[PDB]
Amino acid sequence: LADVADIKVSTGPSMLKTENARPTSWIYIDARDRDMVSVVHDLQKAIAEK
Amino acid sequence: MNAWLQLNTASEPMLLIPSQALIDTGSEQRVITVDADGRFVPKRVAVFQASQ
């Protein structure tokens, strides 16, 4: 086969999430100890600043 | 009659590792070394060739 082609390893798309045609990635968070809103609010700060 | 001819050829001594322990992203190849304290540490390597 290498007489009629090359073979090279690559890194690319695994699966394209298409929410409303716009590509997107989801970040799954599992917090159970705290209360929901208090967590997301703190997540909103950490992400905003860093 | 037909006859299958299998050969084995020795090659210049190089560092050898089980093929399963070789990661590849197409632009870099690496392995995962196991430190003295059990600490798993990664390192880049330059591949030569594989077989069997």
Inform me whether the C-beta atom of residue A20 falls under 8 Å from chain B C-beta atoms: no
Reference B17, options B41, B49, B8; nearest CA is: B49
Angle formed at CA B19 by CA B16 and CA B21, multiple of 5 degrees: 95
Instruction: Please answer whether residues B45 and B29 qualify as being in contact, where contact means their C-beta atoms are separated by less than 8 angstroms.
Output: yes
B23: nearest CA partner in chain A: A9
Nearest to A29 by CA among A15, A19, A39: A39
- Any CB–CB contact under 8 A between A9 and chain B? yes
Task: Determine the Cα–Cα distance for residues B16 and B49; give it in Å rounded to an integer.
Answer: 10
Query: What was the resolution (in A) of this experimentally determined structure?
Result: 4.2
Closest CA to B32 of B52, B47, B17: B17
Chain A / chain B CB contacts < 8 angstroms: 8
> Which structural technique was applied?
X-ray
- The residue in chain B having the minimum alpha-carbon distance to the alpha carbon of residue A10 is B26
- Alpha helices, DSSP H only, in A1-35? none
